[PDB]
Amino acid sequence: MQRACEMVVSLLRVDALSQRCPFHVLNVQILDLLQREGLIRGFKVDGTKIDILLKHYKGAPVIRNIRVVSKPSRDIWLTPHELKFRTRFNTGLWIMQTSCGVISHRDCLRMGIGGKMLMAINNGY
Amino acid sequence: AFDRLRRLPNKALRPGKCAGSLFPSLPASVGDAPSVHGDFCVVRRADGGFHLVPPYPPRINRTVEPYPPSAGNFYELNRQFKLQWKNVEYQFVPKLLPRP
Amino acid sequence: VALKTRAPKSPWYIEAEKEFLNERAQVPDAYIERWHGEDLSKLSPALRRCLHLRCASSKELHSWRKLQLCRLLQRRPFDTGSPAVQLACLTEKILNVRAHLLRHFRDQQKKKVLSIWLSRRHRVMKYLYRVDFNLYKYVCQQLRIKCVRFAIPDSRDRQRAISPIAVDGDRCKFLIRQKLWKARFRPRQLKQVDGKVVRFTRHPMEQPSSAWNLPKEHRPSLSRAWPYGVREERLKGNYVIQNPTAAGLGYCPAPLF
Amino acid sequence: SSLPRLLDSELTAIFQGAAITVSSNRLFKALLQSGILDPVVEFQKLCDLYEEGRFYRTWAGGAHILKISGVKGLAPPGGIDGTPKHMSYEEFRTFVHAVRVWLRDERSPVPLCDATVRA
Amino acid sequence: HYKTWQRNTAGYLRTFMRNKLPNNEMIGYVINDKHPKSIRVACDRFMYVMRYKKTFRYTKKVWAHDEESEARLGDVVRIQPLGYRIGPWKNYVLVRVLHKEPR
RNA sequence: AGAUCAUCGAAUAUAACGG
RNA sequence: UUUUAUGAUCCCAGGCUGGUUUAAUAAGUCAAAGUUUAGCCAGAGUCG
RNA sequence: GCGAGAAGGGAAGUGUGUUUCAAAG
């Protein structure tokens, strides 16, 4: 779980093209969801470290703000009816860790199952 | 701290529950069912009947001193209730409340 | 007013201290650097004396002891990283430093190094206990080391916690335990035959009995100590002690040096 | 068959000899020495039946805890003195009667204590 | 005591489920097996804090009863409550043993 | 019948059982 | 033999809970760590 | 014959209360 929070520092760079990241089982699954939304150009497992590319548009990067909700020292859980109040009138991306794999916040409400808020992408206050 | 006078909480006559039982025939929860009668008892009346009656002294709490200071001027403190029948006497005056 | 001074040394403490050095100075009839007779045959008789252990230095003498002990617990030739070999190698290193501290007492820099090795060896036993239980008991008997099991977390009380210093209780009889001197267990002042009054900061080191934390035969009974009686195994006197290195109530572990 | 009758007078010597109230530790050892119960009954045999019979509760043996501790003794151990119940003459008589038959019915063709059984 | 709105949050519900077991059962490891037919089971519980939104752990040592005396020190077992009081310390009954420590 | 944070008064800690 | 910093021994004081509406893209779906007003449970015995 | 403390704050800290279940005198 500790290695998951170490990906925000590397992926949050302006003047860079590719950054390394420690190899982890959970980290690989997270990158898949981000690529679908069009946030990561691509990634490759280089053995002990994973090389992840950075996407840019008109100079500025596609990622501008990263918020870590879940931490190794504690665990944030929200009911299906409570996640909607938290996440409303926004374009942000919340990573939800449900029993049936990992999915975004939009899919969590559709199934109505209780997920787990891991991190936030392109989120304001 | 040895032989120190302690204090215990008060407890009145617990009313029995309507939904009681006589004898639990192999109960299948993790507890004991309540009783209807509870503390109270049924005795034969004078006129050939059945009525409730206050049982023998219900656990007279001797640990706590009397509240009203003016109790000795109208009542004799330090009383004893003995049970005798012809030349037979039983030792049951100690009214101790055991742990749950 | 009493003066704080060091306590006198007990008569038995001095006698045991000299005996320990005598054993470490013993030189058996053997050879260093694995100088088997095959190669030694090419040398002259005069020259061969120099290669004997009697003419060897401390470094060579100490290294020879490790090889003999390693072979006793050697799984395969040229293999020293196994926990069995490391357990014996560390034991010889601790004694080597302890003997040096007796002759040299102004070397305060090495005092901290000894603690590191003592703690390091303790962790080795914990790992070896969970991976192999039968082997953990066999190695203790050969080295005469107090076997201790790790099945429950150790308590925070010092009167019943573990003590890495007294691990080798069988080999060392003067580093088992001592008395408390913190607030109420302090020693009372006394007057020597000197026209002066002095006080000892530390209590005298008494000689403990041989039956320290050992099984004994119990008598069946029913009282406060045994609400449900005494087990059959306890009567025979064969139960296994979980923490044999416990100092017991009203006692403290011995110092590092 | 033809179980012998235990005379009251005989039990008086055993009860007073082991010595109003007395502890249960000295009575258990004295019972076997007299040999009134007659394999040889072991010390643990009497202890096991004492707990299985629920005699501590019946006799109110736990009432002495509140005298020392008070309110702290009401709660369970985890939510404490553990001395045995000091049986008196009256109390001891009952126990002797109960244990005398518990050994005879252990090998009788027709059980007396518990004859029934649930499937 | 928890308020009405505090009984519907996911944090409190999750903690409740972990603590809650069939027949009010508990999980713990034995730490003392000296007295005959007696074993002290150390159970671990959980609680929720509505201020900092963090859950801690606190040990709960209790006494149990064993018939065959199969359990030994340092062996995780299962306990079941009872609606009475037997002995001075005995307050639980054994069902089974999950793990067994070598000797 | 099971489970079910303790707080204030500045503070001052190891106590009770058997050889 | 048993408790003991996850507070054992031990001194003083405080009895636990509910109460509908309640503005702000803090638009609460139960008023969001802790605020109350008809109310629930509960509160020893004695004429010697 | 039946009803009547309907005016009770004196006791208690791991207690009083709350919550989850159960109860064919």
Side-chain angles (χ1 to χ4, degrees), chain A residues 1-99 101-107 109-125, chain B, chain C, chain D, chain E:
Chain A
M1 187 63 199
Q2 189 170 327
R3 295 282 154 284
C5 305
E6 284 175 3
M7 191 163 78
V8 304
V9 71
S10 69
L11 256 61
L12 201 59
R13 210 160 293 284
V14 177
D15 192 20
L17 183 63
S18 57
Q19 293 284 266
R20 292 179 169 280
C21 194
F23 173 73
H24 197 217
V25 181
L26 195 73
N27 290 4
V28 173
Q29 299 176 35
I30 293 158
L31 301 170
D32 292 340
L33 187 68
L34 269 75
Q35 196 154 15
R36 287 184 186 185
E37 296 271 72
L39 299 161
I40 289 162
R41 188 165 169 204
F43 69 99
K44 190 202 178 196
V45 176
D46 210 52
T48 52
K49 299 184 179 185
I50 308 175
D51 214 334
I52 298 158
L53 269 164
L54 302 178
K55 185 167 155 181
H56 303 85
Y57 183 80
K58 296 193 173 191
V62 73
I63 298 163
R64 300 191 194 175
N65 195 285
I66 329 180
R67 193 161 195 73
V68 178
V69 175
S70 177
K71 308 190 185 197
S73 179
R74 51 174 192 171
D75 45 349
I76 309 304
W77 290 80
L78 296 163
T79 46
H81 86 278
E82 271 187 63
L83 189 69
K84 200 193 80 170
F85 185 76
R86 289 282 146 75
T87 85
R88 60 183 155 75
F89 315 94
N90 55 14
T91 72
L93 183 58
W94 282 275
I95 311 181
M96 294 299 291
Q97 195 174 15
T98 64
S99 188
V102 64
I103 42 164
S104 79
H105 80 115
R106 270 175 254 90
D107 315 308
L109 293 169
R110 204 168 52 77
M111 307 186 203
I113 197 170
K116 171 164 170 153
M117 190 176 283
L118 285 170
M119 258 157 54
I121 305 149
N122 295 349
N123 72 300
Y125 213 80
Chain B
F2 285 113
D3 301 342
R4 277 197 173 187
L5 180 62
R6 304 295 193 194
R7 278 182 164 183
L8 301 174
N10 292 346
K11 199 81 192 73
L13 306 169
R14 309 167 297 170
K17 241 73 80 177
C18 195
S21 315
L22 203 142
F23 162 68
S25 185
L26 190 72
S29 66
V30 78
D32 185 27
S35 179
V36 172
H37 297 99
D39 310 336
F40 300 88
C41 184
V42 189
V43 297
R44 319 195 197 196
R45 219 159 82 162
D47 64 339
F50 293 94
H51 65 279
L52 305 173
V53 66
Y56 45 81
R59 304 92 179 79
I60 297 160
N61 208 47
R62 297 176 169 186
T63 54
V64 190
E65 309 100 320
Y67 158 63
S70 198
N73 290 31
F74 308 100
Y75 302 110
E76 293 187 357
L77 306 165
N78 198 25
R79 281 179 62 185
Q80 197 167 2
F81 294 89
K82 297 102 77 179
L83 308 171
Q84 276 195 3
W85 175 74
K86 297 189 176 189
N87 68 286
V88 180
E89 190 182 322
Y90 264 74
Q91 293 179 356
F92 209 72
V93 301
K95 276 101 78 176
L96 313 173
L97 178 59
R99 70 279 194 276
Chain C
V1 70
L3 191 76
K4 279 185 275 172
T5 55
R6 221 174 198 185
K9 276 196 173 178
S10 47
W12 73 274
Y13 183 37
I14 311 184
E15 189 165 47
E17 190 182 316
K18 293 174 178 185
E19 200 163 48
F20 179 54
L21 299 170
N22 203 64
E23 188 261 316
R24 294 283 91 194
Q26 202 158 33
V27 176
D29 179 26
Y31 275 107
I32 50 167
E33 305 297 320
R34 304 163 179 162
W35 272 123
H36 55 184
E38 186 186 321
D39 291 352
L40 293 172
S41 184
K42 311 186 185 181
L43 266 57
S44 70
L47 217 69
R48 293 180 181 177
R49 299 220 297 279
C50 305
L51 268 73
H52 207 252
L53 261 166
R54 283 192 283 276
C55 208
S57 71
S58 184
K59 275 283 191 174
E60 295 166 315
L61 176 59
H62 182 225
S63 178
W64 179 85
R65 286 169 177 161
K66 281 194 190 171
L67 181 59
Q68 300 295 92
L69 271 165
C70 170
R71 288 173 175 166
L72 187 66
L73 308 167
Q74 183 183 74
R75 207 213 309 282
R76 287 183 289 92
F78 302 95
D79 162 51
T80 55
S82 62
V85 171
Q86 287 191 113
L87 207 78
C89 292
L90 282 158
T91 313
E92 202 72 50
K93 244 168 166 172
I94 291 157
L95 268 79
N96 182 234
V97 181
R98 282 190 180 283
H100 172 239
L101 262 79
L102 259 60
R103 297 164 184 166
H104 288 264
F105 37 80
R106 293 178 180 156
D107 195 351
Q108 289 164 336
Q109 282 202 354
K110 300 210 171 60
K111 288 181 183 182
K112 198 186 287 187
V113 174
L114 184 63
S115 297
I116 292 159
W117 291 0
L118 257 71
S119 301
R120 191 182 291 162
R121 196 180 65 174
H122 180 216
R123 302 199 298 274
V124 180
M125 302 182 113
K126 205 175 185 179
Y127 173 68
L128 186 62
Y129 177 74
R130 63 179 202 78
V131 306
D132 202 345
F133 175 63
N134 282 30
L135 198 76
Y136 184 63
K137 291 195 287 177
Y138 169 72
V139 290
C140 284
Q141 293 171 18
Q142 303 299 315
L143 292 162
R144 295 195 184 176
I145 306 299
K146 294 288 190 184
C147 181
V148 54
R149 305 187 180 199
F150 304 97
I152 42 162
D154 194 24
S155 186
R156 221 169 192 196
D157 197 355
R158 285 282 293 177
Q159 305 191 298
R160 288 169 174 169
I162 199 162
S163 63
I165 293 158
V167 170
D168 56 356
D170 196 22
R171 213 171 205 283
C172 197
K173 285 190 289 187
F174 51 89
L175 283 169
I176 306 176
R177 65 187 189 167
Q178 72 191 315
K179 275 174 170 151
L180 282 98
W181 66 105
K182 275 202 176 194
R184 300 181 197 191
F185 311 100
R186 290 174 298 155
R188 286 176 181 281
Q189 75 202 315
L190 58 101
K191 189 174 185 177
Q192 302 187 317
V193 195
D194 265 298
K196 202 173 181 174
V197 172
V198 293
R199 171 170 274 151
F200 308 140
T201 53
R202 301 291 201 282
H203 273 251
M205 263 278 183
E206 67 193 11
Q207 190 168 25
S209 67
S210 188
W212 178 65
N213 288 357
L214 283 72
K216 62 188 177 186
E217 171 167 353
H218 292 254
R219 200 167 187 190
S221 190
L222 182 68
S223 68
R224 184 175 168 183
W226 297 111
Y228 315 103
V230 184
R231 295 181 74 85
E232 199 198 333
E233 194 173 307
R234 282 270 180 161
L235 301 172
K236 206 158 276 176
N238 47 3
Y239 62 90
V240 179
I241 294 158
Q242 295 290 334
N243 185 30
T245 74
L249 274 158
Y251 273 95
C252 165
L256 180 60
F257 186 71
Chain D
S1 183
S2 298
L3 194 76
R5 314 297 175 78
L6 179 61
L7 304 108
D8 60 340
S9 177
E10 188 158 39
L11 201 73
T12 48
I14 296 162
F15 169 72
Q16 292 184 355
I20 189 166
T21 173
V22 294
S23 184
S24 184
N25 187 40
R26 300 182 191 175
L27 262 62
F28 279 26
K29 290 184 178 178
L31 193 75
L32 304 174
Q33 284 169 0
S34 195
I36 202 80
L37 259 64
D38 306 305
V40 194
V41 171
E42 293 188 12
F43 186 77
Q44 215 182 343
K45 186 67 168 190
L46 304 173
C47 202
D48 284 333
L49 262 56
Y50 166 70
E51 186 173 345
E52 199 160 297
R54 312 297 180 77
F55 288 109
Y56 197 79
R57 199 184 67 200
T58 52
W59 306 116
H64 94 287
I65 309 180
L66 288 99
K67 206 175 284 192
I68 294 157
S69 299
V71 182
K72 297 200 187 202
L74 283 158
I80 292 157
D81 197 21
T83 54
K85 171 55 175 182
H86 290 189
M87 288 169 179
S88 66
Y89 179 70
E90 198 69 67
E91 300 172 356
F92 178 53
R93 196 176 80 122
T94 57
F95 181 59
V96 171
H97 288 55
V99 73
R100 194 177 190 78
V101 72
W102 276 327
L103 293 165
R104 231 295 191 185
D105 77 319
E106 201 145 289
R107 207 169 287 178
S108 181
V110 173
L112 171 56
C113 186
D114 280 307
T116 68
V117 68
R118 291 280 178 162
Chain E
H1 178 263
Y2 290 111
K3 271 189 169 172
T4 311
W5 70 271
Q6 296 179 345
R7 285 181 270 156
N8 284 107
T9 324
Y12 173 75
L13 295 167
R14 191 163 182 76
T15 320
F16 180 76
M17 195 198 77
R18 277 169 150 278
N19 296 339
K20 200 74 173 172
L21 284 164
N23 299 118
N24 304 319
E25 285 170 0
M26 282 142 71
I27 315 293
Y29 57 95
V30 173
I31 53 171
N32 202 313
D33 52 345
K34 292 179 185 176
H35 305 261
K37 298 176 185 173
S38 299
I39 46 171
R40 197 189 180 193
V41 191
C43 176
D44 43 353
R45 311 284 278 164
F46 292 100
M47 204 72 173
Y48 185 80
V49 186
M50 268 286 170
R51 189 171 181 178
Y52 304 107
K53 307 182 173 67
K54 187 165 178 171
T55 54
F56 64 93
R57 194 257 292 168
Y58 57 96
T59 313
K60 189 184 178 171
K61 296 164 282 192
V62 297
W63 284 90
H65 179 90
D66 197 356
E67 296 163 277
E68 297 210 329
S69 298
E70 187 167 28
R72 283 282 186 162
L73 190 132
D75 285 328
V76 291
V77 305
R78 205 158 193 158
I79 59 168
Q80 179 168 13
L82 48 84
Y84 57 87
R85 272 205 80 154
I86 182 160
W89 308 328
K90 294 164 173 170
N91 215 40
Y92 283 87
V93 67
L94 217 72
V95 53
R96 66 177 167 283
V97 173
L98 308 173
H99 203 264
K100 295 178 174 181
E101 190 70 23
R103 293 186 62 76

